[PDB]
Design a protein around this ligand. Structure first.
Ligand SMILES: Nc1ncnc2c1ncn2[C@@H]1O[C@H](COP(=O)(O)OP(=O)(O)OP(=O)(O)O)[C@@H](O)[C@H]1O
Ligand SMILES: Nc1ncnc2c1ncn2[C@@H]1O[C@H](COP(=O)(O)OP(=O)(O)OP(=O)(O)O)[C@@H](O)[C@H]1O
Ligand SMILES: C[C@@H](COc1ccccc1)C(=O)n1nc(N)c2ccc(F)cc21
Ligand SMILES: [Mg+2]
Ligand SMILES: [Mg+2]
Length: 1179
């Protein structure tokens, strides 16, 4: 990584941006490769800014009574803000006095002998130097302002992340991903680019005053009437501005809901596609989009009228400012022209520079105060005592989940529990489902505040949750988890959890690539990775929270009698089990039941007791756009014809008449100038030509989003597995926020500027031909630069924009699995691992900005050089009478200013349309594309499954047959592909082989009609945000009587009744309110509703107790009376019912008709069954 030459650069390079040149030199010819990007300047490393801002912030917190963040931000950046403000003030004043020189230079052309014929050269010199000072003084201030904005935003983001770790657990459920992702996404670009207009809040007044003086020297007593009209205009403008903000704070409440639905949708699309939930999800998403569109539509209309104020107030202001004086005394055309040339600047400085400045100030303060509110949130205070007697004590505790019951003190989820544990002794807390075992572990963690009672243990702790969590990276890094690696300890850990065979099964031996959460791995490997992590880290206390669920039985006995009982035989271990073998081995027992310590003691006591293609694809996608554009062009043609006839009539005029004092020496070259000064009004857009354009643009954005989603969802899984979660969150947030908010106005402004320039040039060329030849050497000079620039930026924006994802995809995981992350106490590690991604995105965005500002330098210097040459050639070549050529040049380069503005707008439009390019990238994704299920008799021949195209053999040469209504139980040691075969039944992943189902095959039936025959309860439960009734059946086919009768079969009464909204309670954060077993029962009910003839059960009993499990087998007898069942269990007890057994081994299936021959065939499997079940199998 080469160090940025910004640190090593001369002052001329910094004031001219000559050091950016190597990037464009490398980029214009060949595509950018990923070493050319410079390392960030040492100033804007996240650490320095974060430390500076946090020190100022916490000192300000300590000092003041009501701390405010904005005071610390001021104390940090105000000086380098004002040092730039003075330069911007000078560089905008230098636009007030330019028309002063310009008017007299224009006055010289007139043959009658004015004194100006001597001062013409001095005026030209002053004008030349004035332009060069403007160029050297304006842009560097803009770049520095953008740089300060960037630094501020970086420090704020790092502070946000530093807060989102110490955030108290009781608040997490309230705040979902939507708030945070919106608060970063909306800020990212707007708050950075918006610190160039922060000054124009106090620049606009002064400038206006300075203008209202000079115009007053021209116009004695009508400039005040013009100013009154302008003040009315500014009040109307601020009124529209206030109206618009009320139409955003009602959208920002639902953007988060749509974002969270989309994230939950795409993270586990596995179950979504398995269930054939395609249309209901689209209906819900578009239902949200409808309201969001109404709000965006109204906001867009309001924003449109705001924009037109410049373009359609120009004639009105001048008319009402020069009617009275002309009426009373008359006007020489010099007065009218200089009034126009001042009125342009006045219009600009009090129509699009004041209101946008106050807008950006309102919005920046709103975001800052929202962040300040965020930082005022309850902090989880830790009392982990390093001093202890190596003895863990817990006494008389009770806990409350929601804070209201906490303060008001519904039963608590615990009460009056107590235990005491030595060092070297193990507890085994076992509870029937819903008792609160995980809640007890959380209370031991202190993450739940005990409403009353006493806790004490060592400060050295480790954790292994019920639900696994896998941060993206290598298995080696994921297991070590930010510790100095060791050969011997790591090898011992891998020897205990017996990961050796599975780790040898992968292509890369030890370290592979795991995505967010790691769908790439199975369930057993994931749980055992988590357990290995909990074993590796060294501490005085261990909280293993039921890691023995997602495994077979032989692996269970091996791991439990080599790792828990043998490897770590001296260090305290809390164990959550549901097998009598553990309790027999257990040293003390605490059996919970419904939040009550139902039994405590010892097992002996227990026995005793009992790119231009996108430019077209965007437009042609909807016909309304083409119609609007065509009709607008026709209207413009009519308008330019009207202007043509007006100038034709006034050209052939045959001239007491003091209405307009006009003379032949002045007329022929002042009428054209004065018309071109008012071109932007006669060619403006009214409320009859503009509104359809904005409406159609918003409609097109909606259609684009809908198509993008419908193409993402039905995409094949092999493609989907490659892309991350950030690569969808980033898109669905930013690349639709842009297509809804910024584009439908920026493209409109571009259309307007292009249209105005074209019309003015056309009409003036028609009346004066040579001006065309006078302009062309500049326009062809313009595009030549633009086409050279775009190649750099056209390739760089992507290289930066995708760089956003390493932020979001790192924020989600840390937030998703915050609990273990804070459990081990590894905050600094993730702090640095986030700062790295932030510095990456900076190394992209900063250099992109430093290239755009350079192109502004170059474009305005092209204009200035042309302008200096024009003024020199023209004034010098003025003759004793009727100087002609100078008029021809100066009119052209009066047009050139607006044309340059149009070029800048065009660059901005392209930089935004990158977003539409990226969305069309997603839309081009491949497509996986009497009662039929009579008996369900199934036949599979020569099946094999592949995850990646041509990948390794996960299965090979499978074939079997299932008679109708004969449940076959499938089993096999973990990591052998049981879920693989279940998934490959649905041909989700790419397949090979042929299946006959009661006289039909795969080919003879369509895909969607094929998946209708099955019903699935996947290994990964799936609960989005919504109500119970909507969650259980989004299609809404069945009455609440149906739901209520099923909800007693599945034994869900005691879960619905305790919750306030029976079938109408809202669910948040993926059902985090519910437990695990309740989620399992919920999904099983969701499969009972969809009565399918052939059904696949993928581990219906994951962590359930021996008691509640009865319901499972219960709903297997009366409920599924005859339906064919593909049941994939691990607990051997659930295999007593099935008639055939399919054992999966060595990537092949072997079927047997019984159990005895199976078990004698594998001797090592025999000694693993518990005696209570071994007697059941062998009578
Ligand atoms: N995050 C939560 N928010 C609200 N209530 C909760 C939450 N977690 C648990 N509960 C309540 O606590 C009870 C069980 O707590 P907990 O989740 O610890 O049981 P569990 O051991 O996970 O259940 P299982 O044995 O099925 O795993 C449930 O009745 C549930 O209503
Ligand atoms: N999403 C995935 N991407 C790549 N490979 C996968 C993926 N899922 C599974 N595999 C491969 O399939 C094998 C295990 O398949 P599968 O997940 O069906 O086992 P399993 O029976 O589900 O395990 P368990 O007993 O934990 O349920 C592993 O070797 C793994 O490499
Ligand atoms: C599109 C117009 C609508 O008005 C008319 C349309 C046709 C004819 C007459 C009037 C507009 O929006 N205008 N016209 C202004 N003179 C103006 C000033 C400030 C502002 F915010 C908007 C403004
Ligand atoms: Mg649990
Ligand atoms: Mg499984």
């Amino acid at each position: 990584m080469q160090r940025s030459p910004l640190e090593k650069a001369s002052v001329v390079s910094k004031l001219f941006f000559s050091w950016t040149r190597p990037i464009l030199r490398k980029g214009y010819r060949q595509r950018l490769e990923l070493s050319d990007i410079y390392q960030i300047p040492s100033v804007d490393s996240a650490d320095n800014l974060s430390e500076k801002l946090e020190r100022e912030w916490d000192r300000e917190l300590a000092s003041k009574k009501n701390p405010k963040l904005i005071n610390a931000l001021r104390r940090c950046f105000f000086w380098r803000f004002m040092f730039y403000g003075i330069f911007l003030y000078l560089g905008e004043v230098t636009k007030a006095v330019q028309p002063l020189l310009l008017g007299r230079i224009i006055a010289s052309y007139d043959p009658d002998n004015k004194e100006e014929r001597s001062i013409a050269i001095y005026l030209g010199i002053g004008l030349c130097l004035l332009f060069i000072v403007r160029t050297l003084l304006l842009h560097p201030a803009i770049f520095g302002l953008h740089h300060i904005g960037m630094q501020m935003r970086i420090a704020m983001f790092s502070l946000i992340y530093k807060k989102t770790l110490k955030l108290s657990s009781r608040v997490l459920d309230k705040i979902s991903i939507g708030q945070l992702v919106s608060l970063l996404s909306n800020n990212l670009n707007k708050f950075d680019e918006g610190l160039a207009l922060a000054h124009f809040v106090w620049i606009a007044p002064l400038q206006v005053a300075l203008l209202m003086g000079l115009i007053w020297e021209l116009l004695q007593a009508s400039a005040f009437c013009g100013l009154g009209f302008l003040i009315v205009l500014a009040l109307f403008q601020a009124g529209l501005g206030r109206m618009m903000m009320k139409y955003r704070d009602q959208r920002a409440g639902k953007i988060s809901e749509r974002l969270v639905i989309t994230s939950e949708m795409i993270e586990n699309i596995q179950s979504v596609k398995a269930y054939c939930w395609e249309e209901a999800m689209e209906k819900m998403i578009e239902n949200l989009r409808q309201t969001e569109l109404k709000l965006t539509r109204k906001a867009a209309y309001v924003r449109y009228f705001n924009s037109s104020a410049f373009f359609f107030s120009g004639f009105f202001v001048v008319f009402l400012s020069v009617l009275p004086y002309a009426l009373i005394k008359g006007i020489i055309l010099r007065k009218i022209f200089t009034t126009i040339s001042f009125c342009i600047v006045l219009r600009m400085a009090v129509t699009r520079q004041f209101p946008w400045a106050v807008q950006t100030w309102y919005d920046s303060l709103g975001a800052i105060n929202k962040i300040q509110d965020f930082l005022q949130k309850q902090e989880y205070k830790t009392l982990e005592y390093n001093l202890t007697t190596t003895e863990v004590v817990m006494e008389n505790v009770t806990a409350f989940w929601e804070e209201g019951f906490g303060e008001l003190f519904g039963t608590p989820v615990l009460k009056d529990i107590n235990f005491k544990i030595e060092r070297g002794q193990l507890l085994a807390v076992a509870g029937s489902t819903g008792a609160g075992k995980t809640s007890l572990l959380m209370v031991i963690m202190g993450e739940l505040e005990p409403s009353e009672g006493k806790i004490k243990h060592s400060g050295r702790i480790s954790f292994c949750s019920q639900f696994s969590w896998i941060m993206p990276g290598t298995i080696k890094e994921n297991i070590i988890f930010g510790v100095s690696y060791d050969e011997y300890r790591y090898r011992s850990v891998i020897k205990a959890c017996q990961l050796e065979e599975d780790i040898s099964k992968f292509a890369e031996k030890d370290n592979i690539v795991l995505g967010e959460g790691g769908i790439t791995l199975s369930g057993g490997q994931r749980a055992r990775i988590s357990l290995a992590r909990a074993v590796y880290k060294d501490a005085d206390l261990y909280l293993l929270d039921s890691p023995f669920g997602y495994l077979d039985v032989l692996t269970e006995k091996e791991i439990f009698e080599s790792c828990v009982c043998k490897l770590m035989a001296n260090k305290t271990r809390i164990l959550v089990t549901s097998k009598m073998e553990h309790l027999k081995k257990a040293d003390k027992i605490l059996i919970l039941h419904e939040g009550s310590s139902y039994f405590y003691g010892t097992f002996s006591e227990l026995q005793n007791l009992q790119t231009w293609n996108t430019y077209l694809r965007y437009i042609t996608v909807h016909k309304s756009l083409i119609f609007v554009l065509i009709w607008c062009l026709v209207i413009f043609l009519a308008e330019v014809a009207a202007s043509l006839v007006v100038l034709w009539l006034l050209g052939n005029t045959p001239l007491n008449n003091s209405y307009a004092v006009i003379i032949t020496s002045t007329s022929s070259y002042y009428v054209f100038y004065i018309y071109v000064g008012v071109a932007d009004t006669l060619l403006a857009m009214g409320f009859f030509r503009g509104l359809p354009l904005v409406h159609t643009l918003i409609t097109v954005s909606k259609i684009l989003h809908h198509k993008m989603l419908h193409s993402v969802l039905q995409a094949p899984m092999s493609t989907l597995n490659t892309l991350k979660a950030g690569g969808i969150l980033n898109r669905f947030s930013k690349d639709i926020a842009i297509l809804d908010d910024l584009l439908p106005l920026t493209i409109f402004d571009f259309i307007q500027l292009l249209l105005i320039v074209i019309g003015a040039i056309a009409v003036v060329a028609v009346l004066q031909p040579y001006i065309f030849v006078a302009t062309v050497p500049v326009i062809v000079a313009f595009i030549m630069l633009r086409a050279y620039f775009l190649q750099t930026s056209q390739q760089l924006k992507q290289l930066e924009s995708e760089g956003r994802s390493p932020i979001f995809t790192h924020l989600v995981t840390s937030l998703k699995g915050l609990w273990t992350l804070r459990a081990f106490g590894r905050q600094p590690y993730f702090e640095t691992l986030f700062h790295k991604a932030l510095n990456l995105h900076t190394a992209n965005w900063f250099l992109y900005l430093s290239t755009l500002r350079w192109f502004q330098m170059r474009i305005e210097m092209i204009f200035v050089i042309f302008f200096i040459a024009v003024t020199f050639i023209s004034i010098l070549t003025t003759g004793e009478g009727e100087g002609r050529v100078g008029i021809i040049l100066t009119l052209a380069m009066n047009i050139m200013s607006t044309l340059q503005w149009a070029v800048n707008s065009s660059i901005d439009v392209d930089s935004l349309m990158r977003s539409v390019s990226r969305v069309f990238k997603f839309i081009d994704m491949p497509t996986e594309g009497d009662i039929w299920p009579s008996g369900g008799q199934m036949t599979v021949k020569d099946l094999t499954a592949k995850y990646t195209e041509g990948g390794n053999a996960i299965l090979e040469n499978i074939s079997f047959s299932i008679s109708p209504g004969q449940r076959v139980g499938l089993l096999g040691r973990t990591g052998s592909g049981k879920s693989t075969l279940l998934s490959a039944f649905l041909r989700l992943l790419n397949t090979e082989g042929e299946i006959q189902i009661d006289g039909v095959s795969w080919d003879s039936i369509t895909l969607q009609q094929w998946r209708k025959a099955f019903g699935v309860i996947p290994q990964k439960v799936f609960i989005f945000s919504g109500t119970f009734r909507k969650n259980l059946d989004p299609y809404e086919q069945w009455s609440d009587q149906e739901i209520w009768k099923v909800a007693d079969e599945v034994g869900l009464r005691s879960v619905i009744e305790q919750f306030p909204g029976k079938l109408d309670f809202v669910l948040v954060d993926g059902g985090c309110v519910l437990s695990h077993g309740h989620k399992q029962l919920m999904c099983l009910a969701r499969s009972v509703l969809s009565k399918a003839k052939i059904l696949l059960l993928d581990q219906p009993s994951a962590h359930l107790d021996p008691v509640t499990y009865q319901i499972i087998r219960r709903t297997l007898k009366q409920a599924f009376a005859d339906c064919t069942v593909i049941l994939c269990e691990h607990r051997i007890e659930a295999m007593l019912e099935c008639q055939q057994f399919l054992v999966i081994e060595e990537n092949k299936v072997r079927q047997y008709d019984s159990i005895q021959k199976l078990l004698n065939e594998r001797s090592l499997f025999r000694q693993a069954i518990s005696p209570s079940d071994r007697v059941k199998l062998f009578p």
